[PDB]
Automatic annotation (TrEMBL):
The species this protein was found in: Human immunodeficiency virus type 1
This protein's name: Env polyprotein
Source organism superkingdom: Viruses
Subcellular location: Host cell membrane; Virion membrane
């Protein structure tokens, strides 16, 4: 609709955060 590639970078960060959260919660 009104979105661009410049806003898709925010969605990429959402999955990137899961790697940080599990990367520290898998070893705990």
């Amino acid at each position: 609709k009104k979105k661009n590639w410049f806003d898709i970078t925010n969605w990429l960060w959402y999955i990137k955060l899961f790697i940080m959260i599990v990367g520290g919660l898998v070893k705990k």
